Short mmCIF file of all heavy atoms in Angstrom, two decimals:
data_model
loop_
_atom_site.label_atom_id
_atom_site.label_comp_id
_atom_site.label_asym_id
_atom_site.label_seq_id
_atom_site.Cartn_x
_atom_site.Cartn_y
_atom_site.Cartn_z
N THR A 15 -11.24 0.49 6.68
CA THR A 15 -12.52 0.50 7.40
C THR A 15 -13.73 0.26 6.50
O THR A 15 -13.78 0.72 5.35
CB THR A 15 -12.72 1.81 8.19
OG1 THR A 15 -12.74 2.91 7.29
CG2 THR A 15 -11.59 2.02 9.18
N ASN A 16 -14.71 -0.47 7.02
CA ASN A 16 -15.97 -0.69 6.32
C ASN A 16 -17.00 0.29 6.84
O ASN A 16 -17.10 0.50 8.05
CB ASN A 16 -16.47 -2.13 6.52
CG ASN A 16 -15.78 -3.12 5.61
OD1 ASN A 16 -15.50 -2.83 4.44
ND2 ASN A 16 -15.52 -4.32 6.13
N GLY A 17 -17.76 0.89 5.94
CA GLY A 17 -18.78 1.86 6.33
C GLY A 17 -20.17 1.33 6.02
O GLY A 17 -20.33 0.18 5.63
N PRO A 18 -21.19 2.17 6.20
CA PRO A 18 -22.57 1.80 5.88
C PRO A 18 -22.74 1.37 4.42
O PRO A 18 -22.06 1.90 3.54
CB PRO A 18 -23.33 3.11 6.11
CG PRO A 18 -22.51 3.85 7.11
CD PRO A 18 -21.08 3.49 6.83
N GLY A 19 -23.64 0.42 4.17
CA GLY A 19 -23.93 -0.01 2.82
C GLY A 19 -22.68 -0.47 2.08
O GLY A 19 -21.93 -1.30 2.59
N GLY A 20 -22.45 0.09 0.90
CA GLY A 20 -21.32 -0.33 0.09
C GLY A 20 -20.07 0.51 0.26
O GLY A 20 -19.17 0.46 -0.58
N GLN A 21 -19.99 1.26 1.36
CA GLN A 21 -18.88 2.18 1.60
C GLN A 21 -17.71 1.52 2.32
O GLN A 21 -17.89 0.68 3.20
CB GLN A 21 -19.37 3.40 2.41
CG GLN A 21 -18.40 4.60 2.40
CD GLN A 21 -17.31 4.54 3.46
OE1 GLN A 21 -17.28 3.65 4.31
NE2 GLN A 21 -16.40 5.50 3.41
N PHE A 22 -16.51 1.92 1.92
CA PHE A 22 -15.31 1.58 2.67
C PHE A 22 -14.33 2.73 2.59
O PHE A 22 -14.39 3.53 1.66
CB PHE A 22 -14.67 0.28 2.15
CG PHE A 22 -14.07 0.39 0.78
CD1 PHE A 22 -12.72 0.70 0.62
CD2 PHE A 22 -14.84 0.19 -0.36
CE1 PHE A 22 -12.15 0.80 -0.65
CE2 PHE A 22 -14.27 0.29 -1.62
CZ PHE A 22 -12.92 0.60 -1.77
N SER A 23 -13.45 2.83 3.58
CA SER A 23 -12.41 3.85 3.54
C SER A 23 -11.05 3.21 3.75
O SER A 23 -10.94 2.14 4.35
CB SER A 23 -12.64 4.90 4.63
OG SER A 23 -13.81 5.65 4.36
N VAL A 24 -10.01 3.86 3.22
CA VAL A 24 -8.64 3.45 3.53
C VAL A 24 -7.83 4.69 3.84
O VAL A 24 -7.91 5.68 3.12
CB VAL A 24 -7.96 2.72 2.36
CG1 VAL A 24 -6.69 2.02 2.84
CG2 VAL A 24 -8.91 1.70 1.76
N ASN A 25 -7.06 4.63 4.91
CA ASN A 25 -6.12 5.68 5.22
C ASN A 25 -4.79 5.01 5.44
O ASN A 25 -4.72 4.03 6.17
CB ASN A 25 -6.55 6.44 6.47
CG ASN A 25 -7.79 7.28 6.23
OD1 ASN A 25 -8.92 6.82 6.40
ND2 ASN A 25 -7.58 8.53 5.81
N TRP A 26 -3.75 5.51 4.79
CA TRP A 26 -2.46 4.85 4.85
C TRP A 26 -1.30 5.85 4.87
O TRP A 26 -1.43 6.98 4.41
CB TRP A 26 -2.33 3.80 3.74
CG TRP A 26 -2.20 4.26 2.30
CD1 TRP A 26 -1.06 4.28 1.57
CD2 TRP A 26 -3.25 4.69 1.41
NE1 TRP A 26 -1.31 4.70 0.29
CE2 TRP A 26 -2.65 4.96 0.16
CE3 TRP A 26 -4.63 4.87 1.54
CZ2 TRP A 26 -3.38 5.41 -0.95
CZ3 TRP A 26 -5.36 5.32 0.44
CH2 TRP A 26 -4.74 5.58 -0.79
N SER A 27 -0.20 5.43 5.48
CA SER A 27 0.95 6.29 5.70
C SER A 27 2.20 5.43 5.75
O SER A 27 2.35 4.59 6.64
CB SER A 27 0.80 7.05 7.02
OG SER A 27 2.04 7.63 7.42
N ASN A 28 3.10 5.65 4.78
CA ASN A 28 4.29 4.81 4.62
C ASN A 28 3.94 3.33 4.67
O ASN A 28 4.52 2.57 5.44
CB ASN A 28 5.33 5.17 5.68
CG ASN A 28 5.84 6.59 5.51
OD1 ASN A 28 6.22 7.00 4.41
ND2 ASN A 28 5.86 7.34 6.60
N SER A 29 2.94 2.96 3.87
CA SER A 29 2.45 1.59 3.82
C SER A 29 3.43 0.68 3.10
O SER A 29 4.40 1.16 2.52
CB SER A 29 1.13 1.55 3.05
OG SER A 29 1.36 1.77 1.66
N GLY A 30 3.20 -0.62 3.17
CA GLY A 30 3.77 -1.54 2.21
C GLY A 30 2.77 -1.69 1.07
O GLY A 30 2.14 -0.71 0.66
N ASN A 31 2.61 -2.92 0.58
CA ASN A 31 1.65 -3.25 -0.46
C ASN A 31 0.35 -3.70 0.20
O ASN A 31 0.38 -4.52 1.12
CB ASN A 31 2.22 -4.38 -1.33
CG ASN A 31 1.37 -4.67 -2.56
OD1 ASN A 31 0.57 -3.85 -3.00
ND2 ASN A 31 1.56 -5.86 -3.12
N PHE A 32 -0.77 -3.12 -0.23
CA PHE A 32 -2.09 -3.54 0.25
C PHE A 32 -3.13 -3.37 -0.83
O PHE A 32 -2.94 -2.60 -1.77
CB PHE A 32 -2.51 -2.74 1.49
CG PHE A 32 -2.84 -1.30 1.19
CD1 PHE A 32 -4.14 -0.95 0.87
CD2 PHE A 32 -1.87 -0.32 1.23
CE1 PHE A 32 -4.46 0.38 0.58
CE2 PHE A 32 -2.19 1.01 0.96
CZ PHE A 32 -3.48 1.35 0.63
N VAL A 33 -4.23 -4.10 -0.69
CA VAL A 33 -5.38 -3.90 -1.55
C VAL A 33 -6.65 -4.28 -0.79
O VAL A 33 -6.70 -5.31 -0.10
CB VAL A 33 -5.25 -4.64 -2.90
CG1 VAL A 33 -5.16 -6.14 -2.68
CG2 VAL A 33 -6.41 -4.31 -3.83
N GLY A 34 -7.66 -3.43 -0.87
CA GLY A 34 -8.88 -3.71 -0.15
C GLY A 34 -10.09 -3.00 -0.73
O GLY A 34 -9.95 -1.94 -1.34
N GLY A 35 -11.26 -3.59 -0.55
CA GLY A 35 -12.49 -2.98 -1.02
C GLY A 35 -13.71 -3.87 -0.93
O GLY A 35 -13.65 -4.99 -0.40
N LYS A 36 -14.82 -3.36 -1.46
CA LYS A 36 -16.13 -3.99 -1.35
C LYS A 36 -16.70 -4.37 -2.71
O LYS A 36 -16.46 -3.70 -3.71
CB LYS A 36 -17.13 -3.06 -0.65
CG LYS A 36 -17.12 -3.14 0.87
CD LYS A 36 -18.24 -2.29 1.47
CE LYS A 36 -18.36 -2.52 2.98
NZ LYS A 36 -19.45 -1.68 3.55
N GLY A 37 -17.47 -5.44 -2.72
CA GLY A 37 -18.17 -5.85 -3.93
C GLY A 37 -18.94 -7.14 -3.77
O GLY A 37 -19.86 -7.23 -2.95
N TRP A 38 -18.55 -8.15 -4.54
CA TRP A 38 -19.33 -9.38 -4.67
C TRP A 38 -18.48 -10.63 -4.67
O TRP A 38 -17.35 -10.62 -5.15
CB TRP A 38 -20.12 -9.34 -5.98
CG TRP A 38 -21.06 -8.19 -6.04
CD1 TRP A 38 -22.37 -8.19 -5.69
CD2 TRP A 38 -20.75 -6.86 -6.46
NE1 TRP A 38 -22.90 -6.93 -5.87
CE2 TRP A 38 -21.93 -6.10 -6.35
CE3 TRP A 38 -19.59 -6.23 -6.94
CZ2 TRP A 38 -21.99 -4.75 -6.68
CZ3 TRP A 38 -19.65 -4.90 -7.27
CH2 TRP A 38 -20.84 -4.17 -7.13
N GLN A 39 -19.03 -11.71 -4.14
CA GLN A 39 -18.38 -13.02 -4.19
C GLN A 39 -19.46 -14.06 -4.40
O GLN A 39 -20.21 -14.39 -3.48
CB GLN A 39 -17.62 -13.29 -2.90
CG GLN A 39 -17.10 -14.72 -2.73
CD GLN A 39 -16.01 -15.08 -3.72
OE1 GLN A 39 -16.25 -15.24 -4.91
NE2 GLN A 39 -14.79 -15.22 -3.22
N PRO A 40 -19.56 -14.60 -5.62
CA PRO A 40 -18.71 -14.34 -6.78
C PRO A 40 -19.15 -13.11 -7.56
O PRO A 40 -20.28 -12.64 -7.39
CB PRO A 40 -18.94 -15.57 -7.64
CG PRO A 40 -20.39 -15.86 -7.40
CD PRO A 40 -20.58 -15.63 -5.93
N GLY A 41 -18.28 -12.61 -8.42
CA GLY A 41 -18.66 -11.59 -9.38
C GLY A 41 -19.32 -12.24 -10.57
O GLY A 41 -19.51 -13.46 -10.58
N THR A 42 -19.69 -11.45 -11.58
CA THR A 42 -20.27 -12.02 -12.80
C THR A 42 -19.62 -11.42 -14.03
O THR A 42 -18.92 -10.40 -13.95
CB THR A 42 -21.78 -11.78 -12.90
OG1 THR A 42 -22.01 -10.38 -13.11
CG2 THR A 42 -22.50 -12.25 -11.63
N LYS A 43 -19.86 -12.03 -15.19
CA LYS A 43 -19.22 -11.63 -16.44
C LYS A 43 -19.85 -10.40 -17.09
O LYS A 43 -19.32 -9.88 -18.08
CB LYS A 43 -19.24 -12.79 -17.44
N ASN A 44 -20.97 -9.93 -16.55
CA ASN A 44 -21.66 -8.80 -17.14
C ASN A 44 -22.13 -7.77 -16.12
O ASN A 44 -23.01 -6.97 -16.40
CB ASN A 44 -22.85 -9.27 -17.97
CG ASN A 44 -23.85 -10.06 -17.16
OD1 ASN A 44 -23.73 -10.19 -15.94
ND2 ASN A 44 -24.86 -10.61 -17.83
N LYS A 45 -21.56 -7.82 -14.92
CA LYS A 45 -22.00 -6.90 -13.87
C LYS A 45 -21.68 -5.46 -14.27
O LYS A 45 -20.59 -5.17 -14.78
CB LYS A 45 -21.36 -7.24 -12.53
CG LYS A 45 -21.90 -6.41 -11.37
CD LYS A 45 -21.30 -6.82 -10.04
CE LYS A 45 -21.66 -8.27 -9.69
NZ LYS A 45 -23.14 -8.46 -9.52
N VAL A 46 -22.65 -4.58 -14.07
CA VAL A 46 -22.42 -3.15 -14.20
C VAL A 46 -22.18 -2.61 -12.80
O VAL A 46 -23.08 -2.63 -11.97
CB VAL A 46 -23.61 -2.42 -14.84
CG1 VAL A 46 -23.42 -0.91 -14.77
CG2 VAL A 46 -23.78 -2.89 -16.28
N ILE A 47 -20.96 -2.15 -12.56
CA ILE A 47 -20.51 -1.77 -11.23
C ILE A 47 -20.45 -0.26 -11.08
O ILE A 47 -19.74 0.44 -11.82
CB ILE A 47 -19.11 -2.37 -10.93
CG1 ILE A 47 -19.17 -3.90 -10.91
CG2 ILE A 47 -18.59 -1.83 -9.60
CD1 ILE A 47 -17.84 -4.59 -10.67
N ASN A 48 -21.20 0.25 -10.11
CA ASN A 48 -21.24 1.68 -9.85
C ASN A 48 -20.38 2.01 -8.63
O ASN A 48 -20.33 1.25 -7.67
CB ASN A 48 -22.69 2.13 -9.64
CG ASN A 48 -23.58 1.80 -10.83
OD1 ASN A 48 -23.25 2.09 -11.98
ND2 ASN A 48 -24.72 1.16 -10.56
N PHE A 49 -19.67 3.13 -8.70
CA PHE A 49 -18.84 3.56 -7.57
C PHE A 49 -18.81 5.07 -7.49
O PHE A 49 -18.95 5.76 -8.49
CB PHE A 49 -17.42 2.97 -7.67
CG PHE A 49 -16.60 3.54 -8.80
CD1 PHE A 49 -15.59 4.46 -8.54
CD2 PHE A 49 -16.84 3.15 -10.11
CE1 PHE A 49 -14.83 4.97 -9.56
CE2 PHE A 49 -16.09 3.68 -11.15
CZ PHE A 49 -15.08 4.59 -10.88
N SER A 50 -18.63 5.59 -6.29
CA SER A 50 -18.56 7.03 -6.11
C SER A 50 -17.79 7.38 -4.84
O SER A 50 -17.84 6.66 -3.84
CB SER A 50 -19.96 7.63 -6.05
OG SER A 50 -20.62 7.21 -4.87
N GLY A 51 -17.07 8.49 -4.88
CA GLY A 51 -16.39 8.96 -3.68
C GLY A 51 -15.15 9.77 -3.97
O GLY A 51 -15.05 10.43 -5.00
N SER A 52 -14.21 9.71 -3.04
CA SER A 52 -13.01 10.54 -3.08
C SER A 52 -11.81 9.64 -3.06
O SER A 52 -11.80 8.62 -2.37
CB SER A 52 -12.99 11.47 -1.87
OG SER A 52 -14.14 12.30 -1.84
#
């Protein structure tokens, strides 16, 4: 799930392989990336 601003959540149970999240397209070679949560 996508939340307000830069927030996203994932809840999973007997999953297969997955990957998901928020950021930038494209990224850069010197980006300072801040993150917070649980």
Side-chain angles (χ1 to χ4, degrees), residues 15-42 44-52:
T15 61
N16 280 322
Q21 195 275 355
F22 68 93
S23 293
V24 194
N25 290 89
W26 71 104
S27 165
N28 296 311
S29 71
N31 188 20
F32 71 90
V33 62
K36 274 186 172 180
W38 300 267
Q39 170 67 290
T42 68
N44 59 6
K45 186 177 297 298
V46 171
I47 296 178
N48 303 310
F49 69 105
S50 68
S52 301

